[PDB]
Amino acid sequence: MRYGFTEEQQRFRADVRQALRSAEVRAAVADATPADGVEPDMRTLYRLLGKLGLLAVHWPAEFGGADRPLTDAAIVAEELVRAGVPDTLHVNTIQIVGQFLLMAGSAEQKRRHLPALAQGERFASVLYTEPDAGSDLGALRTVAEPDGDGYRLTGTKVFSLKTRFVDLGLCAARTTPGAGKYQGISLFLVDLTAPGVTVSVIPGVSDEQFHRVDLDAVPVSGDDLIGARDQGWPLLNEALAIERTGLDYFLKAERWLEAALEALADRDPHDAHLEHIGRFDGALAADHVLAWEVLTGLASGRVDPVTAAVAKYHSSELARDVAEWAAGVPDPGQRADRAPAAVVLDSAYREAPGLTLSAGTSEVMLQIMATAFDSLGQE
């Protein structure tokens, strides 16, 4: 083991950090930060991040990347959030939809789709959840009935973020209904401009809003079914497990703990808070290590669902605990004055309930952990 980073990694971090601290970036970050229930357009910021080559530094150069190790993209992700960049568009486009075309797409689809994502010109979101399919995702009823060498998709997708701002939708559909719960399912890269797509908002307490996507006989080209036909169910699970690190929640918790310290520091002398500050800073320390534990292994081809579930659970739960505690830290004057710490923590409280629900619920993470109890290589 070695806790901490290589001098070469620290030098690459410092250049990213400096690149994100320019006037151009800081101005655009100010304009795009969700706050007070308003979710601003981020397309300009992300164009600028693509120009700086920061969106997908670990992708192949043919596709917009810089051929860097995966751990280098984790260092960028860290510094993006520490510089104020709202990251949900990055997580859905680069870390979920982008990672999935890399893993399961053909050269024809990899080349047609990946580059505009790496440049911040095009965006995607994940259209899995349905009104009757949340935790029970195999209950999805969206159907992709054949049309020549293409398909027509009819269904209802709910509770996605950023969707009214994006171009593409990774959509799970039954290419063979009647095939049993977890059979007959394929993935589509749906063009959200196509006829039959209606996107609308489901208001939520968070700054970033949820969406309903109605699909009424939407045409999907055959070259947009990505992965093996009807083998969609295993592909979603593989993609989710590869995606799970806990890094994104670790960074929300670090931001919020740091906002709460800012609020407290700019105020007269806090014996009440000391214990929470201590435990939260230690749990953050544990959580940084767990997150990088899964990235290290992912960097070396090792996939390990249990350690990834541990990190997701520990980090999402900690971020909720930090948000709940820290929302009470700003005093009335700071709330009245809109001290930036207060703004950030008001957002955090309203965001917190989702963290133990998105990308696998806390209950499903525990189920995945119990998997280890039946393994002979437990110790």
Binding site: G134, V205, P332, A336, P353, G354, L357
Partner: protein, 346 residues
């Protein structure tokens, strides 16, 4: 002890419940979840049922129902999520002061510490900031602290050095050397067992009990209709067990809130009487946080949207759980009283 329901109050609760259900609820998902202040939309229903006379004794022209009735009103107001037009005028009336103001500064412990009053010639000067329970630009009742004496000060709407922060919710009032005189003092805010502060804490505890209770009601109901893996959510141990734990906390909170209301009423007519308002408030603040977090998890993303109505209780607990002080801080005040009683016994 006998805890059979009082028939007069069962009727009073029933009447409040149905009349408050006739008050439309705020329809947004953003912004203030309620319109509170002395004259919010549920004022008409409280006026019609004569709630302003519930606590005052029969000899003073009231109905002689006591603080227990005040607690019922506050709980039913919390369950309805329609705002709280009772709490500030009940506090003022317990001090012989006419109504209509917003109350502010309760969040600071010790009492009044968020607004310090420093002695001047003809009075004091107030500096600090404070959370209001009503319009920050209206007349106000401010918990302030003069040399370690906690007091409640009436402040007029356009007093000098007074800035109203109406952007946020709950709203905020700032004082920059705002001047008050001895005539502006509405009353002391001491730790007396049947004093205005103790009643105000019990009313706030009751309000939090109703909020948690309303939230729990809708999660239990949703868990009964929402199905995943072809079973009711309420039939899955991982959802039902957190909902059953919240019920325990709600019942524990109901126990201390109504014990405290009954003990105050007893002393008004006739071990640990002094700490009962704190016990009730601190249990209710922690219960509301623990209940609402569990309800949100049990209902999924829908808890975060207007598909359910949990979101109004969610934002309410954010503001109300600490409006009368942080629970750990309340618990430490309760702890010192108990340990001091133990030092005396030995």
């Amino acid at each position: 002890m006998d805890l059979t329901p009082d028939p007069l109050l069962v009727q009073l609760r029933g009447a409040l419940r149905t009349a408050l259900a006739g008050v439309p609820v705020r329809s947004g998902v953003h912004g203030p979840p309620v319109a509170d202040g002395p004259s919010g939309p549920a004022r008409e229903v409280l006026d019609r049922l004569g709630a302003a006379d519930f606590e005052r004794p029969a000899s003073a022209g009231g109905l002689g129902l006591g603080l227990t009735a005040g607690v019922v009103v506050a709980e039913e107001l919390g369950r309805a999520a329609c705002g709280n037009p009772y709490r500030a005028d009940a506090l003022a009336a317990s001090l012989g002061h006419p109504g209509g103001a917003a109350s502010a500064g309760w969040e600071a412990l010790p009492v009044g510490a968020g607004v310090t009053a420093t002695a001047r010639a003809g009075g004091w000067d107030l500096t600090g900031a404070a959370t209001a329970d009503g319009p920050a630009d209206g007349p106000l009742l401010v918990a302030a602290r003069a040399g370690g004496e906690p007091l409640l000060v009436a402040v007029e709407p356009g007093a000098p050095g007074l800035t109203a922060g109406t952007g946020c919710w709950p709203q905020v009032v700032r004082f920059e050397a705002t001047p008050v005189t001895p005539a502006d003092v509405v009353g002391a805010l001491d730790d007396s067992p049947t004093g205005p502060l103790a009643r105000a804490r019990l009313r706030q505890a009751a309000y939090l009990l109703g909020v948690a209770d309303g939230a729990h009601r809708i999660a239990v109901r949703h868990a009964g209709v929402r199905r995943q893996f072809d079973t009711r959510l309420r039939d899955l141990p991982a959802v039902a067990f957190p909902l059953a734990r919240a019920m325990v906390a709600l019942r524990a909170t109901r126990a201390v809130v109504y014990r405290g209301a009954s003990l105050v009423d007893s002393q008004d007519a006739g071990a640990g009487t002094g700490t009962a308002p704190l016990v009730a408030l601190a249990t209710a603040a922690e219960t509301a946080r623990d209940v609402v977090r569990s309800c949100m998890q049990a209902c999924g993303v829908r808890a975060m949207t207007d598909e359910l109505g949990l979101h109004r209780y969610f934002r309410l607990v954010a503001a109300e759980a600490g409006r009368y002080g942080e629970p750990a801080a309340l618990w430490r005040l309760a702890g010192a009283a108990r340990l001091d009683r133990a030092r005396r016994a030995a």
